[PDB]
Amino acid sequence: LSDWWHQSVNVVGSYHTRFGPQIRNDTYLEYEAFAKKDWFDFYGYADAPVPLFMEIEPRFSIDKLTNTDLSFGPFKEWYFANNYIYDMGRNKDGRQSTWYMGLGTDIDTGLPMSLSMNVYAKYQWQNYGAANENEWDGYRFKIKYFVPITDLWGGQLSYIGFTNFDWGSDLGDDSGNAINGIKTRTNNSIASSHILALNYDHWHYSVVARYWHDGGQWNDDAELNFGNGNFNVRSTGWGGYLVVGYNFHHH
Ligand SMILES: O=c1ccn([C@@H]2O[C@H](CO)[C@@H](O)[C@H]2O)c(=O)[nH]1
């Protein structure tokens, strides 16, 4: 229902993406959905070519469900938080199923913005045949914030930022070394996103600057050779996205 459940279909063009071994620039369709209903809030998206990648973020209110104002300090509410990533891949081989679960919260900064924090433990299933499949591996700290800027060009300009800090993974330790000498993978990783979004009644535009540090836990500069000659991984650095979409809702 339009009241709480918000949907959108978008077209996305990316440039200098860094989640994998080699840089990528892709375009694709995307389904988005956000929701907030007393005991549960949710965000997620599914991406598909010009096979299927989806990431959901469902959280459940410990307060609401426990029916016990756990409020404290700047912490308005507490949640059983989840960040689950699924990549179907072209082979049941090169696919991924990642489940982050933990404690989350909403901070009240007394400023005209929203700020949330979450820490998760993770269990890995498929991971493109990597060394850390099927086992509990690594942790993640997710910090995201929403800040309404102003009205611009007839629409509402706002800013969105969120970052995913990953550490404690055993990958990298358990992976080989590169032609390069240094290790191929990484025990940790950071993916920070900065978004400038223009929203009209239905259509919306967003520019996204994203910075990676050992993207996809690929140790930056690792020298590999996939059968076309040697090359160097560029997992640390910037990349960006352009997103145009349409949000549905009956008047
Ligand atoms: O953890 C993630 C999150 C996003 N993406 C890529 O970035 C696109 C949009 O975020 C997704 O379709 C996916 O390919 C990843 O590779 N890994």
From Swiss-Prot:
Membrane topology: Multi-pass membrane protein
Subcellular location: Cell outer membrane
InterPro entries per record: Channel_Tsx, Channel_Tsx-like, Channel_Tsx-like_sf
One Pfam family cited in the UniProt record for this chain: Channel_Tsx
Disrupted gene: phenotype observed: Loss of susceptibility to contact-dependent growth inhibition by CdiA-STECO31.
Alphabetical keyword list: Cell outer membrane, Ion transport, Membrane, Porin, Signal, Transmembrane, Transmembrane beta strand, Transport
Biological process annotations from GO: monoatomic ion transport; nucleoside transport; symbiont entry into host cell
GO cellular component: cell outer membrane; pore complex
Molecular function terms, GO-annotated: nucleoside-specific channel forming porin activity
UniProt keyword Repressor present: no
Keyword Glycosyltransferase among record annotations: no
Domain of life: Bacteria
NCBIfam families per the UniProt record, alphabetical: PRK15106.1
Physiological role: Functions as a substrate-specific channel for nucleosides and deoxynucleosides. Has a greater affinity for deoxynucleosides than for nucleosides, and does not transport free bases. In addition, constitutes the receptor for colicin K and phage T6.
UniProt record similarity statement: Belongs to the nucleoside-specific channel-forming outer membrane porin (Tsx) (TC 1.B.10) family.
Protein name: Nucleoside-specific channel-forming protein Tsx
